[PDB]
Design a protein around this nucleic acid. Structure first.
Lengths: 133, 388, 57, 14
RNA sequence: UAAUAACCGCAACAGGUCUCCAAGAAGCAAAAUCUUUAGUUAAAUAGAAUAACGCAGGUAAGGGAAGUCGGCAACAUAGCUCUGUAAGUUAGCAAGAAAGAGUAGCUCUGGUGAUUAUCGAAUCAGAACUUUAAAGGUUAGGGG
RNA sequence: GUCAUCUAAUUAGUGACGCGCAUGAAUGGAUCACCGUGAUUCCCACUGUCCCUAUCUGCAAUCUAGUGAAACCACAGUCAA
RNA sequence: UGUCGGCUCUUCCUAUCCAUUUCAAGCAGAAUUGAAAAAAGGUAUGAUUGUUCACCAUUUAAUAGGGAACGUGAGCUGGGUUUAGACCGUCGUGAGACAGGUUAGUUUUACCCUACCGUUUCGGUAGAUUUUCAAAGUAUUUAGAUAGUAGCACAACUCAGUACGAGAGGAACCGUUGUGUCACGCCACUGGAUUAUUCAAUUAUUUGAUCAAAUAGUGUUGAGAAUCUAACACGUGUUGAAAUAAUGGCUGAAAGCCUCUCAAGCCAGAAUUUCGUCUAGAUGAAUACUUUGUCUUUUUCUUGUUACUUUAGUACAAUUGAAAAU
RNA sequence: CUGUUGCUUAUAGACGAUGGCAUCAGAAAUCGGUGUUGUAAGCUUUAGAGUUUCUUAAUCAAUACUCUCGGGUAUUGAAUG
RNA sequence: GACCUUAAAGGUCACCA
């Protein structure tokens, strides 16, 4: 469901990295299991940056979301990444929103800023984002 | 048995053995293939790396998602004062490769060129080219020169001009020149020698050799590092912390029964002073004539290419220079052998027009804030000194 | 751009932007300014800041 | 089965 | 002499061998750290350069055991005061459970006596102001 | 072993079932409060264990002046078949 | 002859999992299935187990199978197995046994030869005599027998909801733009280390106090230039010609017809080969200067080389050796 | 010619090697540029919460104002003269 | 698999590495 390409965004989120859920779906935190499109290497852990659709499990939330495997998109990250126009930028916390394969967000609202890279990749996230940074 | 999991080998077998070069200058292994349907022209030059800075360039490629306000890219500065052509040599194609037939030199030769032929100049008698210069206008010696010109026109295929730098125009402490042979690509050998003869004793500026937005190949010697271990030289995996006798080494150096260590294993040794050729490097600014400054069509303030406080470990650039996109092999003050591309790049990015919007000239030490010292004083204002 | 703590003019292609969860984003000129900002230090009480020099004289 | 080890000391009384 | 050179270990061996006397700071403390009286500056050689690989001591962006047989190693908690403290239980404990807050400097205020107005003790509590917001130099529990 | 639970995933742990190769009552049976430089599993916190390596210091190693051993040694020391 | 597995690393096989090129299908499209050329390049992350093996959860273009003393312990580890302590079950009268289970159990030496990786020193290639020449010494500019070899893969836009198909569904070639990895580099911007014990602050002790320090083997904390460096920053490897393999064909006999040829002769066709390009490199060549012009041997000076010095000997211009192709 | 030697020499480096200069050589200060930290020491702002001695004089006082965009450091592997 | 016993069925052994 993603539209277009994404430039180089350094991936600061690993396997077993706990992020927050900015949705209103009753899931609090997710831990990344593996990253869609990740090209494997020996002893390398899967890596995710902004706008990267990951496969994550919810270890904290309401019972219909806990102890299950969902699909999310990283909207912000604490790792410092550089834009193509010489802008160096980083957020306050790692957050994600639950989307399906077709790319529509399960929730209805997003809390906090949403990075441009994830907003342009997924048109559904940008519509429900408060601000795009 | 088979290795449990597969992974690419560490290090390239194309650069084996890793032997450090002996001379700072790097000789180009080849020149662009000659075409006989064009005017004679030089196919190379030589400059000294001054440093690096960054620029903001306006994107001219269409059908791209790059920002419309510019893209931040690095640029390497190569100061290239004019060369002096002090001779030429003709090469003949035999059944064992090119063979230099004769070399014809000019009447007047600079002491920078003469210093190459000694090893202790301060003790030498400095009688280089003395007999050649003194008897240059003799009737016998002149006749010999005409034969050399006619021999090349008859039994030669490749003509190169022996050009040497003028080290008095650069902040380097070295006084001995740097000599480079620049092949002449163009018309027939008849008009190639005529072009070479015209260039004798003259000066060739880099603007005549290279154009604008032209991708070139650069050959230079990298930055030395000395004896280095396996981790740095090749990039093997560091061993677990529990390991006896050390962590930064290759655990297994071969199986039992090839009975010998293979050349393909990663062994500790010398990393550093190697010769490397990098192709398809774009010229961003041809710093000759009017473009010798650092101003742009958008930023109109007048400033030179040298950052405040001079280039680190180099000095001040006041001659012609080239702005090359990205990185080239070698530290500051290194000698770089430029060359026209052997395989001309035909990609859309190669033919893209370069329009600079801002060239950074802040100090390359610390976290600088100002572009010129005049605007540093204006912002800061008068201080305790100067006002007292 | 102007630094959030020091108030200096940020040179192009220099500095880091920081975004908080309250939709407010700041840009700084170096790690010296950014560290002071995260320690809740008032630029008015820091002698070298451009904020301080405007307040006094 | 096959074991493995060793050590000793003394080295006469020179 | 009575021991990092006089004793026992092949020796001027980082091992071992019973006792007496015992200053200041700081602190609950014969603790760590620094100093006075006394002792010594030599105790199996040094100088230059500052490669790899080491032994000893360290730090590190983002992630946080995904490494591994296994949180091995290291990180982390750490003093004192006040609030608070569960299941279980041999009813004694668990318990410093767990968890939270305070702590600096300076200028002051008050309580605790002796002797019959003068003299004296470190201890506790409280209040304004200031700053780089305070056990942490050293010493100093990870918890369930 | 079968059923639950712990995990995204459990030859591990825990709670149950029991025709138990070959449990069982001073060869002591069942039970655990406090205790343990005992064996095992799971959480929180923390981190170079790891992604993936970078870098700093002292002492060596390197070179030199003086001094100066030992293990080992049929003869020796380039490969393929 | 140190006996399992794992970790690290290199190479080799093809009975090939992916990528490339083809043929066949009960191949309409998509997804597939069988086979040929081809081994140059890739082939992952975790829960449980010491495990090899296995079974699950993911991801990927694919997560193929194997060898090298069942590769690899003076490479690591010591989980298992496999001494000596201890416990249980069964067996034995007993000492004790158990491919029955559990727990704790020292992993020594390279300074030798070679191999490999780097790095020095000395030696050096035979047949030209147009003095505008020939040779030796020193130095630069070049040269290139040989050896290695490097770039791969994926995604998005358009093609296009088009071809095909009743519908459901549903492509590809050119072109454009990015990402990941590998290799080579590099210090501008971003980040990290920091004994410039830089600047500042501050706890304890000592200088009578202030200043200024010292001590706590770098007291500690904040910022911190330089240098080094990123899996954390960023550049290049989008690159050109010819011949090919499997296969598809052209002309065309054998064999009056047919036939791509177990015939002669050609064309198209691969992540293929060779040029071209990159790295190391042998005998070499040109030029500058110093010489010598029939020649060396043995001594001898120099750090070393050439020229050079002395005593003798030797030769002295003049008929050699070319068709090519079939 | 070449090597040693010197620049406690660098674009180099374990040692050799490699690269540059060697009297228009070299080295060193100082000065300017350029960076880093954060406003030196001495005296002055009822500064200043309050205290004491006076009897509106002083004294003590964390911290704080002006001189002060100050002071200090800056090649050691930075750039000029 | 080997030994034994019953009217196919059982029972004991199957060890050191």
């Amino acid at each position: 469901g993603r539209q277009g390409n994404k430039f180089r965004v350094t991936c600061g989120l690993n396997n077993a990295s706990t992020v927050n859920c900015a949705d209103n779906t009753g899931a609090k935190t997710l831990t990344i299991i593996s990253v869609k499109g990740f090209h494997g290497r020996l002893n390398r852990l899967p890596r995710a940056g902004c706008g990267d659709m990951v496969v994550a499990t919810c270890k904290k939330g309401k019972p219909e979301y806990r102890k299950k495997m969902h699909t999310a998109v990283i909207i912000r990250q604490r790792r410092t990444w550089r834009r193509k126009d010489g802008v160096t930028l980083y957020f306050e916390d790692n957050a994600a929103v639950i989307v399906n394969m077709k790319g529509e967000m399960k929730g209805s609202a997003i809390t906090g800023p949403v990075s441009k890279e994830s907003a342009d990749l997924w048109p559904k996230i940008s519509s429900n984002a408060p601000t795009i940074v | 048995s088979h290795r449990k999991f597969e992974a690419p080998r560490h290090g390239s077998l194309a650069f084996h053995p890793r032997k450090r070069v002996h001379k700072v200058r790097a000789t180009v292994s080849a020149f662009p293939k000659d075409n006989a349907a064009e005017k004679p022209h030089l196919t190379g030059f030589l400059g000294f790396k001054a440093g690096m800075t960054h620029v903001i360039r306006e994107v001219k490629r269409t059908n791209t998602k790059l920002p419309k306000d510019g893209v931040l890219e690095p640029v390497t500065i190569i100061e290239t004062p004019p060369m002096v052509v002090a001779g030429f040599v003709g090469y003949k194609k035999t059944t064992t490769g090119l063979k230099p037939i004769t070399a014809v030199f000019a009447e007047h030769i600079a002491d920078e060129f003469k210093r190459r032929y000694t090893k202790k100049w301060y003790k030498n008698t400095k009688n280089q080219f003395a007999v050649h210069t003194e008897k240059y206008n003799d009737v016998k010696a002149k006749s010999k020169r005409e034969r050399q010109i006619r021999l090349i026109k008859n039994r030669c295929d490749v003509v190169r001009v022996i050009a040497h730098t003028q080290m008095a125009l650069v902040p380097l402490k070295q006084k001995k020149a740097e000599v480079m042979e620049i092949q002449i690509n163009g018309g027939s050998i008849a008009e190639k020698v005529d072009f070479a003869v015209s260039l004798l004793e003259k000066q060739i500026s880099v603007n005549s050799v290279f154009g604008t937005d032209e991708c070139i190949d650069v050959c230079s010697v990298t930055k030395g590092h000395g004896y280095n271990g396996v981790i740095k030289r090749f990039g093997v995996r560091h061993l677990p912390r529990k390991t006896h006798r050390g962590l930064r080494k290759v655990a297994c150096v071969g199986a039992w029964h090839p009975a010998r260590v293979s050349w393909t294993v990663a062994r500790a040794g010398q990393m550093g002073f190697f010769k490397r050729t990098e192709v398809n490097k774009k010229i961003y600014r041809l710093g000759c004539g009017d473009l010798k400054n650092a101003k742009t069509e958008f930023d109109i303030t007048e400033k030179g290419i040298t950052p405040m406080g001079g280039f680190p470990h180099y000095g001040v650039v006041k001659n012609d220079f080239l702005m090359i996109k990205g990185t080239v092999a070698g530290i500051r003050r290194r000698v770089i052998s430029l060359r026209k591309a052997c395989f001309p790049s035909t990609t859309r990015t190669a033919q893209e027009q370069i329009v600079l919007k801002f060239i950074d000239t802040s100090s390359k030490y610390g976290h600088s804030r100002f572009q010129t010292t005049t605007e540093k004083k204006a912002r800061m204002g008068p201080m305790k000194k100067d006002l007292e | 751009q102007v630094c959030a703590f020091s108030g200096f003019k940020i040179p192009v292609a220099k500095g880091r932007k920081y975004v908080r969860l309250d939709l407010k984003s700041f840009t700084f000129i170096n790690k010296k300014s950014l560290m002071q900002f995260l320690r809740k230090t008032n630029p008015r009480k820091v002698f070298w800041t451009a904020i301080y020099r405007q307040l006094n004289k | 089965x096959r074991x493995x080890x060793x050590x000793x000391x003394x080295x006469x009384x020179x």
